[PDB]
Write a protein that holds these residues in place. Structure first.
Motif, mmCIF file in Angstrom:
data_model
loop_
_atom_site.group_PDB
_atom_site.id
_atom_site.type_symbol
_atom_site.label_atom_id
_atom_site.label_comp_id
_atom_site.label_asym_id
_atom_site.label_seq_id
_atom_site.Cartn_x
_atom_site.Cartn_y
_atom_site.Cartn_z
ATOM 1 N N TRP B 112 47.437 -52.307 6.538
ATOM 2 C CA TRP B 112 46.122 -52.099 7.134
ATOM 3 C C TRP B 112 45.330 -51.143 6.239
ATOM 4 O O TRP B 112 44.164 -51.387 5.910
ATOM 5 N N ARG B 117 38.735 -55.211 3.036
ATOM 6 C CA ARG B 117 37.657 -55.657 3.909
ATOM 7 C C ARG B 117 37.575 -54.983 5.280
ATOM 8 O O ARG B 117 36.683 -55.297 6.071
ATOM 9 N N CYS B 118 38.474 -54.045 5.562
ATOM 10 C CA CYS B 118 38.461 -53.373 6.857
ATOM 11 C C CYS B 118 37.721 -52.028 6.856
ATOM 12 O O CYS B 118 38.131 -51.086 6.187
ATOM 13 N N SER B 160 45.012 -50.092 19.103
ATOM 14 C CA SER B 160 45.379 -50.925 17.960
ATOM 15 C C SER B 160 46.861 -51.289 18.010
ATOM 16 O O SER B 160 47.714 -50.442 18.285
ATOM 17 N N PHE B 287 47.392 -59.056 14.754
ATOM 18 C CA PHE B 287 47.020 -57.655 14.831
ATOM 19 C C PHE B 287 45.660 -57.510 15.477
ATOM 20 O O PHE B 287 44.807 -58.396 15.374
ATOM 21 N N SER B 288 45.459 -56.386 16.147
ATOM 22 C CA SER B 288 44.201 -56.157 16.826
ATOM 23 C C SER B 288 43.833 -54.689 16.882
ATOM 24 O O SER B 288 44.687 -53.810 16.785
ATOM 25 N N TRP B 290 39.691 -52.834 17.792
ATOM 26 C CA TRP B 290 38.551 -53.028 18.670
ATOM 27 C C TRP B 290 37.356 -53.468 17.829
ATOM 28 O O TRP B 290 37.352 -53.288 16.614
ATOM 29 N N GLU B 295 29.848 -57.442 14.785
ATOM 30 C CA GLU B 295 30.675 -58.643 14.709
ATOM 31 C C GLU B 295 30.248 -59.627 15.806
ATOM 32 O O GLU B 295 30.183 -60.840 15.580
ATOM 33 N N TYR B 409 45.606 -64.232 3.104
ATOM 34 C CA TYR B 409 45.261 -65.501 3.711
ATOM 35 C C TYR B 409 46.390 -66.466 3.347
ATOM 36 O O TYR B 409 47.049 -66.301 2.320
HETATM 37 C C1 HEM Z 1 40.426 -49.912 15.219
HETATM 38 C C2 HEM Z 1 39.407 -50.822 15.153
HETATM 39 C C3 HEM Z 1 39.055 -51.584 14.014
HETATM 40 C C4 HEM Z 1 37.792 -51.868 13.646
HETATM 41 C C5 HEM Z 1 36.537 -51.209 14.243
HETATM 42 C C6 HEM Z 1 37.853 -52.795 12.518
HETATM 43 C C7 HEM Z 1 36.743 -53.477 12.014
HETATM 44 C C8 HEM Z 1 36.797 -54.496 11.056
HETATM 45 C C9 HEM Z 1 35.667 -55.329 10.684
HETATM 46 C C10 HEM Z 1 34.177 -55.106 10.982
HETATM 47 C C11 HEM Z 1 36.186 -56.314 9.903
HETATM 48 C C12 HEM Z 1 35.435 -57.528 9.351
HETATM 49 C C13 HEM Z 1 35.521 -58.667 10.354
HETATM 50 C C14 HEM Z 1 34.807 -59.917 9.882
HETATM 51 O O1 HEM Z 1 33.663 -59.800 9.389
HETATM 52 O O2 HEM Z 1 35.384 -61.016 10.010
HETATM 53 C C15 HEM Z 1 37.587 -56.026 9.706
HETATM 54 C C16 HEM Z 1 38.410 -56.750 8.863
HETATM 55 C C17 HEM Z 1 39.790 -56.569 8.763
HETATM 56 N N1 HEM Z 1 40.530 -55.616 9.466
HETATM 57 FE FE1 HEM Z 1 39.824 -54.140 10.579
HETATM 58 N N2 HEM Z 1 39.145 -53.018 12.116
HETATM 59 C C18 HEM Z 1 39.896 -52.294 13.051
HETATM 60 C C19 HEM Z 1 41.292 -52.429 13.192
HETATM 61 C C20 HEM Z 1 42.125 -53.205 12.403
HETATM 62 C C21 HEM Z 1 43.578 -53.277 12.575
HETATM 63 C C22 HEM Z 1 44.451 -52.679 13.669
HETATM 64 C C23 HEM Z 1 44.055 -54.007 11.534
HETATM 65 C C24 HEM Z 1 45.392 -54.328 11.194
HETATM 66 C C25 HEM Z 1 46.562 -53.709 11.518
HETATM 67 C C26 HEM Z 1 42.882 -54.417 10.781
HETATM 68 C C27 HEM Z 1 42.946 -55.257 9.682
HETATM 69 C C28 HEM Z 1 41.843 -55.829 9.067
HETATM 70 C C29 HEM Z 1 41.923 -56.861 8.058
HETATM 71 C C30 HEM Z 1 43.195 -57.395 7.381
HETATM 72 C C31 HEM Z 1 40.632 -57.319 7.880
HETATM 73 C C32 HEM Z 1 40.165 -58.511 7.049
HETATM 74 C C33 HEM Z 1 40.350 -59.774 7.875
HETATM 75 C C34 HEM Z 1 39.812 -61.003 7.182
HETATM 76 O O3 HEM Z 1 39.982 -61.106 5.950
HETATM 77 O O4 HEM Z 1 39.226 -61.870 7.868
HETATM 78 N N3 HEM Z 1 41.697 -53.922 11.302
HETATM 79 N N4 HEM Z 1 37.978 -54.917 10.433
#
Ligand code: HEM
Ligand code: HEM
Ligand SMILES: Nc1nc2c(c(=O)[nH]1)N1C(=O)OC[C@H]1CN2
Ligand SMILES: Nc1nc2c(c(=O)[nH]1)N1C(=O)OC[C@H]1CN2
Ligand SMILES: C[As](C)(=O)[O-]
Ligand SMILES: C[As](C)(=O)[O-]
Ligand SMILES: [Zn+2]
Lengths: 416, 414
Positions: B112, B117-118, B160, B287-288, B290, B295, B409
Motif C-alpha cells: 500500500w 496512485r494512492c 482500512s 482491499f478497502s 474509505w 471519486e 494489474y
Molecule cells: C484510507 C483511505 C484511502 C483513501 C482516501 C484512498 C484514496 C485513493 C484514491 C483517490 C485512489 C484513486 C482511485 C481511482 O481514481 O480509481 C486510490 C488508489 C489506490 N489505492 Fe488508495 N486510498 C485509501 C486506502 C487504500 C488502501 C487500504 C489500500 C490498500 C491496502 C489502497 C490502495 C490503493 C491502490 C493500489 C490504488 C490504485 C488502484 C488502481 O490502480 O486502480 N488505498 N486510493
C-alpha cells in the motif's frame, strides 16, 4: 499488435498508435526505472549557454535533417533543389561554422516549433501564425520598435492574432540578442518591508532588475513593467511600453456586482519572450511569440495560485463562504466564479479568449488531425489538462505520449 | 542519477534516492514518456502454469525477508539468517515458498505504502490484515469476504482492511474475484445502445446473468459476486443487503437534489488487483479504505462514460447549457461534490474531501522523505479530477517508479 506505443481514450474507448515518436532525436528525462514526466524544468532540453562554436558535425546533421523536413513539407524530397540546398548548407557551415535559413524556411520552422510544443493546448491554430522576420535587427532600440509592432499587430484591438518575431540567431564569437522579461507584458512585484509582495510575486526578480537598471517603480498591484532589451555584447537597455499599446481588461462578474469593486484586471496579450527557438541547429535566443489566453491561465493560475495573486480567500469571504473548513469547498466555488468573471469581462471588452472546455475540445480535434497527418502528437498530459475541472474536459480521459521533436521552443538560462 | 524534485508553491527542493531501489521497469524510455497510460502493454502478471525461476524468485524472496527483519530492527539476528535458510531450502526443493503471518502483514502494508496512485497513503500503517490463505472453496471466499465487509464498514466508521486468499501456484488455476470491486452497481445495455445503471459494469453484469443471476432494472442495483476457486467455474453469491451500507444523496441547500434518487455505497474495495510479496503472487486480495469525495461526486457520477449526470443537475439548477463559457459544467460539478460530502457526513459515514486528502498526502511525502529518502507518486492520479491547482499536490513535482511489495494489474479471468 504494432511495435509502437498504444494510446487509449477511456471516454470513447478508441485506440491509436503513436509512430511519430520514432522520429524523436532528443532524449527526454525518463528511463525504464522512473518517470520524471511531471518535472517542470528537467535538465535535458535546457539550452544552457554553449559559447564556443558547436561541432560542425552535430550542427550539420541537425541542419540536413531540418532541410529534409522542409523539402518534405513542400513535397520535393529528393529533388535537385533539395540536394542543392543541402550542398549549400554544408558549404556554408564548411567555411563559416554556421548557416542561414531562407525566408520560407524560417516561416516553416517557426510554425513547426509551435506544432511540436508538448505543453501547448492551443496547437489546433499552429497553421495560422504571423512570422515577423527581424533577423536584420542590430540594436536594442530597433528590438523595441519590432516588439511594439508585434504587440500592435497581435493585439489588433481585441481581435488577437498569433504572431512571433524572430531576431538574429546565436553567432559564435558574438553576444546574444535577449529579452530579459519572461513575457512582453508583466505586472511588477514589489517586495514589502514585512516580507510580503505587492503585485505579482512571480515577477519579483525582474522587477528588481528593472529598478537596478534605472526604472522608477510605482506601488500598485498592476503596474506594467518596462522591457529590458539586450543587443549583442551591450548591457540591457530599458524601454517603457506606451500605455496605449498595452490593452487591459478590468474584471467584473456577470451577477456578483461587488466583484468589479475588487479592482482586479489582466492584460489581453500573452507573449512569452524568454524562450529559445531552435531550428536545424540554429538558435534564436530572442524570438517572442504570442497567441490569446485560455481563461484558466488568468482566472485559476495567475489569480488563484498561492504564490501568485492568491485572491481565493478574498473572493470566498465576499461570497460569504465557510473558509474555516475544507469540506465546504469554498476554494472550488470562488475559483469557479473568478474564472467566469475572466470569461465575462473579456467577452464584454470584445477581447479574444477561450475557456478550458472549448480549448480542450478543439485540442482533441487537433489530435485526430495529427494522428492522420504525422501518426501522432507529442503531448504533456499534466500541462494539457486544465488547472480546474480536469475530468470534466475530454483531454483528462486521453492518454498521451510525450517526446521531443525539432524545430522546438526550449527553455534557456537567464541572461543575468 | 538521483532526481531533483521541486515544489513550485514553496520553492523547496528534495532529492529522491529511493528510486534507486526500483528493480522493476516502467513504460518510459529516454525516447518518450508513457507515464500517463493507465495500463502497461504487458507488464501485467503472465500465467503461472510453470514454477518461477529459482534464481529470480530466491532473489526477490531474500530481498523481501531482508526488508522485513530490517523493519523489526532484527536485521542480522539468528532469526533473520535462519528465515533465509528456510526460504532457500523451500525454493530449492519445491520451487516456491510460503510467508509467515507476520511477514504477510508487513508485506501488505508495504504494498500500500508503495502504491504510486494512492493519495491516502498517510494511513498506510493502519491496515487490518485478514489471512484467508486457509481457503479451499468459492463458498469459503464468500464467508471471508462478508467478514471483511462487516469489519471494514463498521456501521459507518470505516476501517482500512485487506483479505489475502491463497497465493498462485504453478500447478493450478488462480483464486479470483471476478468483480473489480466488492460493491458495484449493475449496468444493463438496453436495446437502443443505451445503458441503465453504471456503464463501467456492463461486462460484469452480463457475466453474472450468464451464470444464473436474476437481474433487476434500476440504476443502483448492487451486483452479486462471482468468486472463482482454482480451475473451477465461478460461482454466484448475493451479498446480504444489511452488509452493503449505502448513502442516499441530497444537497445542503438545493431541496430538489434528493428528488434525483442518487445514492452510492460506503465501502470502496478493489478486488481485481494482484498483491505481490517477495516474489509470491496473491491473485485474490481485496482491499478497502474509505472514499475521497471526488471519486463519487466527480468521476463516478460525472464522467461521460459513467452516470453522466452533469447536464441533468445543470438543468435543475437552471443553468445556461447553451455555451461552455457559462461554466455550467464546473458549477454543477461543485454542487454534486458538495452533495456527496453533505450526505456522507449526514449519514455518519467516513469520507474525505480532496483538499484535506491532498494536504495529508503532502505531509506523507515529507514523512517518506525522511524515512526512505523519497516516495513514488503518479502525478496524474494523485491530483484530483476537479480543482487541481487549488490543491497542494498540483504544484509538487513527483517521481514515479515501481517498488515491491506491490499491487499490480492482472488479466481478466474470463
Ligand atoms: C484510507 C483511505 C484511502 C483513501 C482516501 C484512498 C484514496 C485513493 C484514491 C483517490 C485512489 C484513486 C482511485 C481511482 O481514481 O480509481 C486510490 C488508489 C489506490 N489505492 Fe488508495 N486510498 C485509501 C486506502 C487504500 C488502501 C487500504 C489500500 C490498500 C491496502 C489502497 C490502495 C490503493 C491502490 C493500489 C490504488 C490504485 C488502484 C488502481 O490502480 O486502480 N488505498 N486510493
Ligand atoms: C492561439 C492561442 C493559444 C492558446 C490559447 C495557447 C494556450 C497555451 C496554454 C494554456 C499554455 C500553458 C501556459 C502555462 O501554463 O504556463 C501554452 C503553452 C505553450 N504554448 Fe500555447 N497557446 C496559444 C498560442 C501559442 C503560440 C502562438 C505559440 C507559439 C508560436 C505557443 C507556444 C506554446 C509553448 C512553447 C508553450 C509551452 C511553454 C512552456 O514550456 O512553459 N502557444 N499555450
Ligand atoms: N498548464 C500548466 N500545467 C502545469 C504546470 C504549469 O505551469 N502549467 N505546472 C505547475 O504550475 O506546477 C507543476 C506543473 C503541473 N502542470
Ligand atoms: N485518479 C485518477 N486519475 C487519472 C485516471 C484515473 O482513472 N484515476 N485516469 C483516467 O480516468 O484517464 C486517464 C488517467 C488520468 N488520471
Ligand atoms: C465585495 As467584498 C464583500
Ligand atoms: C430539480 As430537477 C429539474
Ligand atoms: Zn515518463
Amino acid at each position: 499488435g504494432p511495435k509502437f506505443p498504444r494510446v487509449k481514450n477511456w471516454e470513447l474507448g478508441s485506440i491509436t498508435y503513436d509512430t511519430l515518436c520514432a522520429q524523436s532525436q532528443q532524449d527526454g528525462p525518463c528511463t525504464p526505472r522512473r518517470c520524471l514526466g511531471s518535472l517542470v524544468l528537467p535538465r535535458k532540453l535546457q539550452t544552457r549557454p554553449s559559447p564556443g562554436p558547436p561541432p560542425a558535425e552535430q550542427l550539420l546533421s541537425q541542419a540536413r535533417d531540418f532541410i529534409n523536413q522542409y523539402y518534405s513539407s513542400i513535397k520535393r524530397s529528393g529533388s535537385q533543389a533539395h540536394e542543392e540546398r543541402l550542398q549549400e548548407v554544408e558549404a556554408e557551415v564548411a567555411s563559416t561554422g554556421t548557416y542561414h535559413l531562407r525566408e520560407s524556411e524560417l516561416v516553416f520552422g517557426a510554425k513547426q516549433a509551435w506544432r511540436n510544443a508538448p505543453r501547448c493546448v492551443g496547437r489546433i491554430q499552429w497553421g495560422k501564425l504571423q512570422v515577423f522576420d527581424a533577423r536584420d535587427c542590430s540594436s536594442a532600440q530597433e528590438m523595441f520598435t519590432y516588439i511594439c509592432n508585434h504587440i500592435k499587430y497581435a493585439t489588433n484591438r481585441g481581435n488577437l492574432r498569433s504572431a512571433i518575431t524572430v531576431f538574429p540567431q546565436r553567432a559564435p564569437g558574438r553576444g546574444d540578442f535577449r529579452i530579459w522579461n519572461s513575457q512582453l507584458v508583466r505586472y511588477a512585484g514589489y517586495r514589502q518591508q514585512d516580507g510580503s509582495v505587492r503585485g505579482d510575486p512571480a515577477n519579483v526578480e525582474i522587477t528588481e532588475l528593472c529598478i537596478q537598471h534605472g526604472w522608477t517603480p510605482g506601488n500598485g498591484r498592476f503596474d506594467v513593467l518596462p522591457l529590458l532589451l539586450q543587443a549583442p555584447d551591450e548591457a540591457p537597455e530599458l524601454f517603457v511600453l506606451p500605455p496605449e499599446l498595452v490593452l487591459e481588461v478590468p474584471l467584473e462578474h456577470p451577477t456578483l456586482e461587488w466583484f468589479a469593486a475588487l479592482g482586479l484586471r489582466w492584460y489581453a496579450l500573452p507573449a512569452v519572450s524568454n524562450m529559445l527557438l531552435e531550428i536545424g541547429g540554429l538558435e534564436f535566443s530572442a524570438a517572442p511569440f504570442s497567441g490569446w489566453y485560455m481563461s484558466t491561465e488568468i482566472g485559476t493560475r495567475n489569480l488563484c495560485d498561492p504564490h501568485r495573486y492568491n485572491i481565493l480567500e478574498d473572493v470566498a469571504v465576499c461570497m460569504d463562504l465557510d473558509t474555516r473548513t475544507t469540506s465546504s469547498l469554498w476554494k472550488d466555488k470562488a475559483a469557479v466564479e473568478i474564472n467566469l468573471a475572466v470569461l465575462h469581462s473579456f467577452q464584454l471588452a470584445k477581447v479574444t479568449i477561450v475557456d478550458h472546455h472549448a480549448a480542450t475540445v478543439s485540442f482533441m480535434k487537433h489530435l485526430d488531425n495529427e494522428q492522420k497527418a504525422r501518426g501522432g502528437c507529442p503531448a504533456d498530459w499534466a500541462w494539457i489538462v486544465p488547472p480546474i475541472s480536469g475530468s470534466l474536459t475530454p483531454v483528462f480521459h486521453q492518454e498521451m505520449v510525450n517526446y521531443i521533436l525539432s524545430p522546438a521552443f526550449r527553455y534557456q538560462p537567464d541572461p543575468w
